Amino acid sequence: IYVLDYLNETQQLTPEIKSKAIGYLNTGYQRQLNYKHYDGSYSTFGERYGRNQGNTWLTAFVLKTFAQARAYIFIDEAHITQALIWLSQRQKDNGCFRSSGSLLNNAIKGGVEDEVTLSAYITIALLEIPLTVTHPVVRNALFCLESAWKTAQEGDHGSHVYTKALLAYAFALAGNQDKRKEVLKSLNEEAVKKDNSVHWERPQKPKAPVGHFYEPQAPSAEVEMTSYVLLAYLTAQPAPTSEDLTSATNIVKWITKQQNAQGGFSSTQDTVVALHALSKYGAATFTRTGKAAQVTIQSSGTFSSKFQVDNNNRLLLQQVSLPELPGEYSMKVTGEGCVYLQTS
Amino acid sequence: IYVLDYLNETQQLTPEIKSKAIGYLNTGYQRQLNYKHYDGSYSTFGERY
Amino acid sequence: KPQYMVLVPSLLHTETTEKGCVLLSYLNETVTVSASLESVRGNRSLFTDLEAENDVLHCVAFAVPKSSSNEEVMFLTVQVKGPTQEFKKRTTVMVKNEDSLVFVQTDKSIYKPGQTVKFRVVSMDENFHPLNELIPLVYIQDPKGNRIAQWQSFQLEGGLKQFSFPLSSEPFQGSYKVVVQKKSGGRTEHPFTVEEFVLPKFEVQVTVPKIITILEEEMNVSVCGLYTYGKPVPGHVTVSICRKYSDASDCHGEDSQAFCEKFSGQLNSHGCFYQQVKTKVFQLKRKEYEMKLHTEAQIQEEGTVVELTGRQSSEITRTITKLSFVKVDSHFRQGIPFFGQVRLVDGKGVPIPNKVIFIRGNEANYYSNATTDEHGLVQFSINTTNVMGTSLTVRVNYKDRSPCYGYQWVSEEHEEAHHTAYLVFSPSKSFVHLEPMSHELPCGHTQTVQAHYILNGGTLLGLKKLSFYYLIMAKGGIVRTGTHGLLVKQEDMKGHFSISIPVKSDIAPVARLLIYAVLPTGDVIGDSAKYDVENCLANKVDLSFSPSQSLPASHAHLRVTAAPQSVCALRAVDQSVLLMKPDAELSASSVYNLLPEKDLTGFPGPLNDQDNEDCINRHNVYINGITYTPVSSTNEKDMYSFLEDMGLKAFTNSKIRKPKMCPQLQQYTVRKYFPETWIWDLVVVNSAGVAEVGVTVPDTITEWKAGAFCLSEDAGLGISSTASLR
Amino acid sequence: EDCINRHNVYINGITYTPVSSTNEKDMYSFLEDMGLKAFTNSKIRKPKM
Ligand SMILES: *[C@@H]1O[C@H](CO)[C@@H](O[C@@H]2O[C@H](CO)[C@@H](O)[C@H](O)[C@H]2NC(C)=O)[C@H](O)[C@H]1NC(C)=O
Ligand SMILES: *[C@H]1O[C@H](CO)[C@@H](O[C@@H]2O[C@H](CO)[C@@H](O)[C@H](O)[C@H]2NC(C)=O)[C@H](O)[C@H]1NC(C)=O
Ligand SMILES: *[C@@H]1O[C@H](CO)[C@@H](O)[C@H](O)[C@H]1NC(C)=O
Ligand SMILES: *[C@@H]1O[C@H](CO)[C@@H](O)[C@H](O)[C@H]1NC(C)=O
Ligand SMILES: *[C@@H]1O[C@H](CO)[C@@H](O)[C@H](O)[C@H]1NC(C)=O
Ligand SMILES: *[C@@H]1O[C@H](CO)[C@@H](O)[C@H](O)[C@H]1NC(C)=O
């Protein structure tokens, strides 16, 4: 679904791949209905085994996918409603709903299973649905988030990144401009930025021992979390600003560099969230009608240059040198269509 | 499908029965795809044989 | 600890008011509760609040409007805010755009050509107070799937309306219908036949066992044909008592009828005919099925024969000597004697006196004898200090159908009293069970139930006295409430205490009473109850008439009593077609079973439950003593469960639910006037009861089924009796 | 012969519990691993059911 949206938003698509993907989507949808619970919950096996209860994160993952799938193809609201009320039912008074661990693999999920991170992924998956912040469930969710954020902020460690990033993204979905400002500032403090981009990572050397093959029982989940960081940068109530877009550009450069030649990315979660992030980026940046951009560079030593950008040369890298020692290079852009301007 | 048409032609319908029938239709469609042939033909059992 | 408890039926009838209760106690009185019933999807919010104090129960009746969908779920949250305390708890509530309960009533059941049908329609809400409302549609339908008449978009103002429609001279014959359609899409029906016929002037009636069994050599039978003014009729009688389903093929011209025995009689001038028959020709055995009796009186000087089908279902039952329960506690407890009262009957339904029996209480090892008294009753008592779940049985004979049970070609059995009971969870080791009057409950009267409260240690620290709180639930909602506090003995177990309560009305044919006592330590006990409330109405009503008279004796009266400002629907009908064919389910029982959701018992389906998190599962179960041993789930009754089968749901903090651990993580001079009707009208009841003047129809002699159906906004509806005017 | 089987293992508390045998070292087992045998009256062997 997320690659469907990537294709349709970048416009590199066709009705054939479209129809084949649509068939895939209906097929996977129904084969997934064949695993859920009578209450509406969802399990790995589920049906044909009466003694069972579903998992939370899995129900949330299927909910998010049902959301965007509704966004593209048809799907019924009753299933998402039932899974939603199920998510509510598990919630505590002020604590957030528990983890009814009924999975088979920790690779499918990129998080650490913590109630904090779990509830964060859940409530953000909620907020991707058009959901009022005034809702009870979300009200309690934000309460959890604020609490957990303060505990991890004032604390010298709350994993420092993944928790904090997911919290940031959910806080952005709320409306708490100040809160998202402070948290993104904090994540920006602990930076893994590089020669021409930015990203984030887990501690890189866990304090306690680890396994052998690729750090087993630890996917290390850098792409998905960086993608969520990006996603958090991309969302304001009227439209984002410039500086969030620059940060987004850098982290997206890292993202696209971190893509696997086999296709997708190192897993399914990170692939999904990364494609969601890039889709939202292009929805912001990649305008399909803005096609008349004109750039004009002017420098105090009468060093003037001019460039044009349109659809035909959309992917063009127009490069030009800059000889003057004291650089006072005034860029001036006009027209339509976003432009990235990388100087070194 | 034909009763769907009947309801929607006579106008004695609603979006609820509509959506439930739509789900039935997709489900039966796919469960039927699970019986066809690789050439495109269709059999009672078909697949897994 | 400071304590609260808020309670409400899990269902919500919308577009009206619904009651819910709250209890509060033990400190920081200045508290504010608030219920928020919210439509999750999209958004809706209905907000309700109250400010309250300690040691008080109070119930608020919040109202709900209509919605978009017919039936929905809603998040009900509740917030308790005391000056130094806060608590919040939510759940799912079933909301439903209830369909008003409505119906019809005709002038007559059957019709002949040239006449006009006349009927009326009625509607009401949960409360049987009348309801004024616009109806989308009602219509009359002709048997071919085609329509004959229709009326649309009409508003009830007295909570009812009347309509008529004339029939042609040569329409279609058969079972015509009338139908109503409501704005919800709900539809209702009331049939009526249409055909030619003659007016009867007598009715045959048999007397015979309504229930006949195996061990029967003979049978009393009698034939009595009532007449006009119930007078004796002379002529001829012939009955055809019959068994059915012989070895015939029920096909190829083979009559399925088994032995049909025919008895003639000359129906005498005075009195009625009798006959004692012998059942040897019937072979009251395995493969000779139920008993139909078709009695045909040919009245003389007309040649006119009419039949009655009778006692078709005379239960020739295998289960002979069937004893019974009456008042069985469903439950027992580890610290108590329970005493079941148990009647004994057999066959016809007559109790046997002085008959020994054996009573086996298993997992109490209580094998005790008793006997049947004049009423077949035994009140066996069993002390209970024992294991989890108890089984109980009683017999008069042993655990087998002693005479020739194994042949595959046998027809006999004997009932066995069977019953099972589970105990409460009471970690306090205190509990309150109730001794009820568990049988038929009259109306308009007070009754005292009694209660066996017991207190492990009493209040541990607490204060001196304690409190009990009882609720009487009706029609899936709430009706009545109260409480009672009592000074506790210092550290001791006090057993008995009674509670009286009124049975005026306003309560379902079931009355779900419960009670619960509360402990400042955060603890609680209680117990439910059930009373088969006799079908009985709030608004009393009555009828009368100036008495019977002669043939054209025009001036007659009808009178009715009801509430001082009301109306009544008055159906006097010449009882000949009604003699020919009866009415249809017209009674208070009609009103009652027409109700939607008689009993709220258990939550609905779409909502499952609300789970909690406490898992006491040890790594190893830590079973000190002689040996170790694993974990397992129990099976026993709970307060959460008491309030579930009660029907409602509640929020609190105390230990209500048992600490069910989490499952295992391990995985892989006269001029005739119209007959067939006398009076069909509406009338108004002043503040002194009404009295109208009916007008004696001539040239007609039968019963006069008078029917009174009254209505007032204040007292609700009323159903008065079958007064004749012979 | 000292079989200690209750009808059920008789827990009052969170729930009831089932039966199971144990696994721990014993004086009888001490003397068996010793390689010898003996006769007494006291409780040496665990009260196996
Ligand atoms: C394809 O991607 C576009 C990117 O804008 C999505 O947005 C739609 O663009 C089409 C262009 O014709 C508009 O007509 C729609 O109003 C836009 N909004 C929609 C339809 O969601 C669009 O979702 C995708 N599909 C298309 C091309 O409509
Ligand atoms: C069933 O009912 C309608 C009745 O007209 C069917 O016909 C369609 O009506 C729509 C009305 O806008 C036309 O635009 C279509 O051209 C008609 N043919 C279609 C849509 O197949 C239609 O088959 C069904 N659904 C409706 C109500 O359109
Ligand atoms: C839902 O939210 C809006 C927010 O302004 C509120 O005004 C509205 O009354 C609510 N209910 C409906 C049906 O829109
Ligand atoms: C209730 O009041 C007492 C005294 O003011 C206070 O100590 C307590 O914290 C309050 N809240 C409780 C018992 O929850
Ligand atoms: C009914 O049967 C009994 C014998 O069982 C007999 O004595 C009696 O006369 C019969 N008739 C009536 C009215 O009891
Ligand atoms: C049943 O017990 C009573 C004593 O309580 C005894 O009289 C009676 O004989 C016993 N039953 C039989 C069949 O003897």
Ligand SMILES: *[C@@H]1O[C@H](CO)[C@@H](O)[C@H](O)[C@H]1NC(C)=O
């Ligand atoms: C009930 O029976 C048990 C048997 O031990 C006894 O302990 C208890 O005192 C009896 N209670 C009575 C007769 O009230």
